Amino acid sequence: RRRYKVLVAKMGLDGHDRGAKVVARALRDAGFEVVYTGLRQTPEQVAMAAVQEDVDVIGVSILNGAHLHLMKRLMAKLRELGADDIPVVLGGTIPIPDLEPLRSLGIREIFLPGTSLGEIIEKVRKLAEEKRMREEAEA
């Protein structure tokens, strides 16, 4: 309870991901509780972390890799764990022909290089607010 809680996770190619840290720190400065290891993770590790830390929003940063196959695996494992209501957002350089397929998996927002930090915070806020409302809207 208290502050909205966000998991920020790196997935994909093990290269240098500068973006992910900056998002994590911007979310913290905007008053969210942020889980961020700094380390590349597999889709199952993300999904488990997410449910173990009982987060409000999952933010994934893929600098490069096979976005659709990774996000398909993450989405499946969340669903397995009964956590499919947790909203997931994705950042990276995603080719335009992949944007719709990714949204079809149920990713709520895709943050491209041109998306401002301010926009990120606002959408993550909105999604976490919704997520709590939907939870708290069940007895």
Closest CA to 9 of 29, 34, 36, 27: 36
Domain hosting residue 113, numbered range: 1-139
Query: Residue 61's CB: how many other CB atoms inside 10 A?
Result: 24
- How many Å apart are CA 20 and CA 134, to the nearest integer? 27
Q: Are 92 and 61 in contact (CB under 8 A)?
A: yes
Q: Are 8 and 20 in contact (CB under 8 A)?
A: yes
DSSP assignment of 83-126: -TTS-EEEEE---HHHHHHHHHTT--EEE-TT--HHHHHHHHHH
- Which own/partner pairs from 93-98 qualify as long-range (CB within 8 Å, at least 24 positions apart)? 93/63, 93/64, 94/62, 94/67, 98/67, 98/68
The count of domains in the chain is 1
Tokens of 124: 């993550």
Q: Please give the method by which this entry was determined.
A: X-ray
Q: At a CB cut-off of 8 Å and minimum separation 6, what does 94 contact? A: 62, 67, 102, 110, 112
- How many Å apart are CA 80 and CA 82, to the nearest integer? 5
Residue 91 sits in a domain whose CATH number is 3.40.50.280
